[PDB]
C-alpha cells in the first residue's frame with residue numbers, strides 16, 4: 137500500500153544524454169543510434185532569441201561547430217539537419233547504449249517522466265503531465281533545454297517531450313522528438329501566454345480510485361450523478377468535460393473497487409462544491425490530476441520493466 | 443524555474459538490483475561487489491512471520507537454497523551470513539556494474555530516493571523522507587521488500603534504506619544496509635504502531651524559501667518571531683522544535699533571498715494559525731516537509747551527477 141508520484145526508472149535514458157555546445161550556448165542532446173537530437177535554439181545567442189531566423193542562422197554553422205560530448209569523450213559530427221524545431225546531428229558512432237525506443241506525440245492529459253539534465257549530466261527525475269493548455273509544469277533552469285520526457289513499456293522507451301522554453305509565468309513548453317511544439321508555442325522570446333489550466337477530470341477520478349484502494353475513503357458518499365449533470369459542475373470549476381470514452385477507460389478501476397464511475401463522479405462533485413474541509417486524500421489537500429488511469433493500475437499492481 | 447519533488451537518477455542502482463528466492467518467497471536483493479544484501483525474512487513463510495526465530499530458521503538453509511538471479515542469469519552463492527535483520531549472500535562474481543558507494547544511516551528529517559522493485563526489476567522511482575517517528579511513507583506492494591533507498595553525491599551512491607515491513611496503518615518500516623531497523627520496528631508480524639507523525643519544521647522552511655525563489659510570495663508578511671515564540675506554535679501543531687542548528691543550516695537560503703530565517707518562521711507561524719485560505723504554494727495546498735535545505739539549494743542551482 138501507499139501511493140506516490142512515481143517516475144520511470146531513468147537508467148535507459150541516462151545512457152542517451154550528451155552535451156551539445158554551439159558557440160557560447162550549451163544544452164543537452166539525446167543520442168539514439170547515430171543521431172543526436174537537440175533544440176535548434178542551440179544556434180542562437182540570447183540576442184537572437186527575440187526574433188531568430190533559424191534557416192539563416194544555420195547557414196553559418198558547419199558540422200565542426202557542433203561540439204557533442206558523451207561523458208568525457210567527444211563524438212564526431214558527420215552531418216546535420218533541421219527538422220521543425222530540433223536539430224539532428226549525425227555522428228560517426230552509434231550509441232552503444234541505445235535502448236529499444238519509439239517517438240510518440242502524446243495527447244493532453246497523458247503523463248510522462250522527465251530526466252532533468254545540465255551539461256549532458258542527469259540531475260534528477262520527476263513525473264509530469266501534458267496540460268490541457270499544452271504546457272507542462274516542470275523544474276527547469278538555464279541549461280536544462282534538451283532534457284527529455286518519456287514513458288517505458290517493459291523494455292521500450294517512448295520519447296514524447298523535449299524541453300525548449302520557459303514562459304514568463306514559469307510554466308514550460310517543448311516539442312515532440314520530431315521537433316513539433318505541443319500547443320501554439322514557438323522558440324522565440326516573445327509575448328506568448330498559456331491559456332486556462334483546466335483540470336484533467338479523468339485523472340482526478342483515477343486518483344480517487346487509488347485513494348479507495350489504499351484505504352482513504354472518507355469522501356465516498358450516498359449519491360450518484362450523470363455525465364451531463366457532472367459536466368455542469370466540471371464547467372464551473374474549469375474541469376475537462378467527462379466523456380463516455382473516459383468512463384470506459386475507468387472501467388477496470390470501477391470493477392476492482394466495485395464503485396460505479398458515476399458514483400465516484402458524485403463524490404468528486406461534492407468535493408468540488410464543498411472543499412476538503414481541511415482533510416487530505418493520499419496526503420494531498422487538493423485534487424491530484426497527474427495520475428492517469430493506466431498509472432493507477434500500474435502502481436497498484438506493481439508492473440515492472442527490463 | 444518551477445520546483446518539483448525530484449528523485450535521483452536511478453541508473454546506478456538499477457544496475458545493482460537482483461531477485462532473491464528462498465523456498466516459496468521471492469523479493470529483491472542489492473548486488474554490490476560479490477555480496478547480495480536482502481531482508482532476512484526471505485527465509486520465512488507467512489506463518490513464520492507471527493513469531494520467527496531467525497537463527498533457528500536459518501539452520502535449515504544452505505547456500506544452494508538461495509536462488510539469486512540477475513536479469514536472466516543465475517548467480518552462484520558461495521556463502522551466507524545474517525547481520526542484524528539482513529542477509530549477506532556471497533556470490534562468486536563481482537557485480538560488474540557496482541558503482542562507487544557507501545552505507546549511511548540517516549537521521550529523521552533526511553530525504554532519499556527509493557527505486558521500487560518487484561522480482562529484481564525496477565518499477566519506478568520516488569522521493570521519501572525518514573519521518574520523525576522513523577517510518578517512511580512509501581509505495582510498496584507484496585514483493586517490493588529489498589527495494590532500497592539512496593542518495594547520490596556526484597558519482598557515489600550512499601545507500602541508507604532497505605524495505606522490510608508495512609504496518610497496519612499503511613506506512614513503512616525498514617533497515618539501513620547494516621540490517622538495523624530505523625526506529626523501534628521489528629521484522630515480525632505483530633502489534634507495533636507508529637508514534638506521532640510530526641512535521642519536519644526545517645524542511646517546511648526550506649520549501650518556503652524554494653517558493654519565494656520561484657515567485658510564490660503571497661505568504662510573506664510584516665512580522666518576525668523568536669525561536670522560543672515560534673516553538674510554542676510548533677508544539678501546538680506537532681511540528682519539530684526549531685533549533686539554532688536548523689537556523690544555521692538555512693543560512694545560505696536566507697542569504698540568497700534576503701529573508702531572515704526568523705522572518706520566514708513568522709510567515710510559517712501565520713500559515714499554521716490561519717491556514718492557506720484556499721491558496722496554494724508551489725502547487726500544494728498543505729505545507730510540504732520532504733524537501734531538505736540541501737535539496738532546495740541543489741534543485742534551485744542545478745547540481746548534476748556522473
Ligand SMILES: Nc1c2c(nc3c1CCC3)CCCC2
Pocket residue numbers: 413414715716717718
Ligand atoms: N477555516 C479554517 C480556519 C483555520 N485553519 C484552516 C481552516 C480550513 C482548513 C485550515 C484557522 C483559523 C480559523 C479558521
Ligand SMILES: Nc1c2c(nc3c1CCC3)CCCC2
Pocket residue numbers: 409410411412719720
Ligand atoms: N470555506 C470553503 C468553502 C468551500 N470551499 C472551500 C472553502 C475553503 C477552501 C475550499 C465551498 C463551500 C463554502 C465554503
Ligand SMILES: [Cl-]
Pocket residue numbers: 142143144431434435566
Ligand atoms: Cl509510474
Ligand SMILES: [Cl-]
Pocket residue numbers: 260448449450737740741
Ligand atoms: Cl534531488
